[PDB]
């Protein structure tokens with residue numbers, strides 16, 4: 056007969072995808088359209104990418120954004136996995152770019168804002184989309200922006216970097232093409248930068264037939280900047296496409312740029328109301344039960360006097376006043392011909408004594424000896440204490456001790472890096488317990504644990 | 515009166531008071547006292563939680579008052595000795611400090627309400643209240659009278675505030691107008707420390723022959739002695755000690771008795787100081803209104 | 815109902831079984847690497863075999879058994895209870911399994927050189943100078959990547975000094991510790 060899932064029957068093919076192909080579903084009764092990602096069990100069983108697909112669905116499930124393809128449900132069977140998604144008519148942006156040639160400022164600015172709000176949403180949710188490209192972003196009937204593929208994505212862990220280098224050849228960041236560790240916001244921002252470029256010039260900023268010459272073209276911060284557009288965009292693109300990841304633009308830096316501000320709807324970043332729900336939704340854990348399903352009606356009907364509503368709205372007002380005089384919650388960077396700085400009353404004595412010296416924090420324990428030789432020399436000291444270790448990769452250890460005063464146990468991780476050819480650096484990282492009082496500090500126990508180890512490595 | 519300001523504190527946790535990103539320093543009880551005080555000035559912090567390695571828990575708190583106590587307690591002369599405190603250690607000084615009386619560490623969970631914090635400040639008569647997560651046992655932040663007041667006025671809505679705030683300070687009877695602990699401009703810094711130990715006051719506004727406030731000597735101001743390595747000589751006057759900042763401070767922040775409470779709180783949080791010395795046309799001392807007064811006048 | 819795939823090449827392909835009359839032929843549909851169809855089958859076990867290019871053959875990919883006639887047929891259990899999501903997949907660290915706690919000695923087989931230090935950790939938050947007007951205890955919002963990592967200060971004294979920037983629910987704190995040697 057014909058394949059169908061639930062009340063949706065499978066139609067024409069949309070595309071090939073990463074793992075398995077995708078087709079259009081059609082509701083037997085109403086006629087609604089949904090995009091399904093079919094991942095065949097036989098194929099996904101072969102590879103160990105079972106975790107690759109797991110993380111994807113896990114993240115996309117709780118994702119709601121107008122420009123992020125919203126994952127409705129995921130049905131699966133011994134034959135094959137299915138993921139139904141919001142279907143859109145416009146197709147991929149690369150079809151829109153090529154067909155329409157080059158896009159003007161009024162248009163390009165519009166779309167870039169939508170996509171950047173998408174990746175911002177992702178970054179704030181601790182999930183990065185590594186493969187970014189016009190071939191990955193769709194358009195609805197209204198020719199808006201929709202970010203589609205998450206198969207190449209990853210989740211951002213606290214105090215953890217990403218080794219895997221994934222995505223298109225031209226859109227890959229200068230640090231990922233070289234195969235270097237990265238945080239993950241900066242790699243999407245660089246991919247966003249070349250998308251912004253393609254949204255204007257109609258051609259790719261870094262393009263070549265022969266490689267690594269393309270990657271060498273990428274490693275160098277050189278790219279054609281035609282007179283096509285004004286310098287405001289060029290200053291943006293240069294700051295966004297900066298080869299040095301430390302000098303690269305942040306999501307915030309793009310929000311504070313001039314060209315970006317112009318004609319920017321306030322429904323993208325959640326300060327003002329919604330046009331076409333936000334992080335302030337997580338007040339429930341303390342007050343009441345989950346509430347995500349229950350109080351939607353309590354805020355949909357515009358009833359602001361409900362016991363759940365009077366607990367919701369005042370939270371968004373709270374966060375707005377936090378930005379007002381933000382010098383209260385966060386510290387400010389140092390201050391043209393502008394002088395006056397009235398010091399905090401508790402800051403008065405030090406600046407004066409300085410002008411009527413040396414405090415410098417090192418990264419970690421540093422020593423210059425051989426990479427296999429040092430870890431072995433460390434692996435001696437780690438034992439000597441009576442603490443214990445399991446080794447993951449030759450230079451990466453996972454260690455722990457038993458608390459002497461209580462039956463509690465604290466752990467940590469040691470990852471060795473190479474600062475240069477002449478020297479190596481050993482990193483120390485804390486950890487966390489799995490997802491009633493305690494007479495001990497998890498933060499201090501970490502320091503004492505390192506301290507004991509360091510004392511033996513030094514003396 | 516208690517309809518709004520009192521309810522507001524009960525409706526919010528101490529969690530909200532904690533800055534988005536902040537610094538904290540802690541000292542092991544095995545550390546020497548001399549080194550601990552120098553570490554304070556290099557970090558700018560005026561308080562650090564005391565951790566015990568043996569007990570594996572936070573035993574207490576260390577503020578500038580401890581530097582004052584030990585300075586007045588062990589002292590002979592500006593030249594002759596310096597001997598007692600230099601070879602002294604935190605746990606050793608804690609021993610002679612607890613020789614007289616035993617007071618344990620007080621701390622509040624960030625999940626507890628702001629009302630529970632202000633209570634702990636008045637009930638225990640303490641300026642620094644460290645907030646510690648009971649689940650993890652980690653010290654997150656140190657609560658201060660300054661931090662609460664700023665948070666109060668900044669986040670409180672404008673409908674609740676107008677009740678008793680419109681009344682004059684004189685008529686409200688808030689603060690201590692009875693015995694004003696002060697020092698002269700020529701009075702040695704040691705006798706100033708002597709008043710700091712005799713009373714619980716956080717500052718000593720200095721006065722001239724007339725009894726007019728020409729400067730103020732806070733318990734914070736004494737840490738400068740450690741900052742400049744001048745703590746050796748305690749025979750110098752408070753004016754000579756405050757001479758370090760003499761070209762930098764604008765003046766002495768003060769108020770009047772006839773002024774409204776509304777005007778006081780706003781000026782007090784904007785100045786970011788801990789107290790104001792009320793005066794008259796002659797600028798002679800009348801009384802002092804510390805944050806403690808404002809905070810204690812709210813809870814009840 | 816249920817569906818079956820066929821991974822071996824063939825020109826004309828049919829599928830039979832015990833559900834349909836023991837002699838029944840169901841026309842299969844084609845794809846690039848596969849050939850499939852769908853039928854409504856009753857609750858229970860089953861015995862089926864494929865008819866390709868004129869010869870009856872079985873798929874080695876699927877399980878196999880011997881029927882009463884002595885032929886080679888496959889096995890499938892049809893149910894309506896499999897909508898599963900996490901059962902299909904069948905610390906919490908990066909998912910690459912290997913060994914366990916409490917023991918080790920020496921080098922692994924692999925000769926990979928150590929990774930280069932990322933520029934992120936080299937940027938320190940305590941060495942950064944804050945504004946003069948703001949509270950001394952405040953610090954800028956740290957990057958999530960440099961949070962758990964330890965930052966030790968050179969021991970220029972008889973006391974060790976080391977800190978780290980640990981995060982709380984919505985807040986961050988950098989805790990410094992002075993511990994004697």
Ligand SMILES: OC[C@H]1O[C@@H]2O[C@H]3[C@H](O)[C@@H](O)[C@@H](O[C@H]4[C@H](O)[C@@H](O)[C@@H](O[C@H]5[C@H](O)[C@@H](O)[C@@H](O[C@H]6[C@H](O)[C@@H](O)[C@@H](O[C@H]7[C@H](O)[C@@H](O)[C@@H](O[C@H]8[C@H](O)[C@@H](O)[C@@H](O[C@H]1[C@H](O)[C@H]2O)O[C@@H]8CO)O[C@@H]7CO)O[C@@H]6CO)O[C@@H]5CO)O[C@@H]4CO)O[C@@H]3CO
Nearest residue numbers: 830831836837861862863870871881882883884885886887
């Ligand atoms: O026709 C039904 C049958 O079709 C399919 O079978 C194909 C098979 O997969 C191919 O391998 C090939 O079969 C050739 C075979 O390999 C050769 O060995 C030979 O067959 C000989 C047998 O070895 C031999 O055993 C004999 O069979 C006798 C049995 O011993 C005896 O029991 C009796 O069988 C009866 C059964 O007892 C009873 O259960 C019932 O059988 C049914 C089956 O249970 C059922 O699975 C199905 O069989 C399918 C099969 O699934 C397909 O794969 O239907 C059966 C109903 O008929 O009924 C049986 C009889 O009433 O029968 C004999 C007694 O003499 O037979 C030969 C001896 O020369 O030749 C085979 C080639 O033709 O091809 C077939 C399809 O053509």
Ligand SMILES: Nc1ncnc2c1ncn2[C@@H]1O[C@H](COP(=O)(O)O)[C@@H](O)[C@H]1O
Nearest residue numbers: 574575577579580618619620640641642
């Ligand atoms: N939270 C606290 N727990 C225990 N003792 C404290 C605490 N806060 C202050 N102290 C003690 O009081 C003195 C500091 O007072 P103060 O400067 O007013 O906060 C020190 O000698 C401390 O021992």
Ligand SMILES: Nc1ncnc2c1ncn2[C@@H]1O[C@H](COP(=O)(O)O)[C@@H](O)[C@H]1O
Nearest residue numbers: 689690694695714715716717802804806
């Ligand atoms: N110099 C002072 N002399 C006497 N009492 C004071 C002085 N300063 C403040 N107070 C009172 O002490 C309380 C505040 O204490 P503190 O926060 O430590 O300065 C308030 O009730 C004040 O009225």
Ligand SMILES: Nc1ncnc2c1ncn2[C@@H]1O[C@H](COP(=O)(O)O)[C@@H](O)[C@H]1O
Nearest residue numbers: 400732734735765766767787788789790
């Ligand atoms: N009423 C005041 N007027 C002027 N300066 C003050 C006043 N109160 C405190 N300070 C200054 O602020 C510091 C102490 O602050 P605090 O510990 O909060 O009272 C010292 O450097 C004082 O000089």
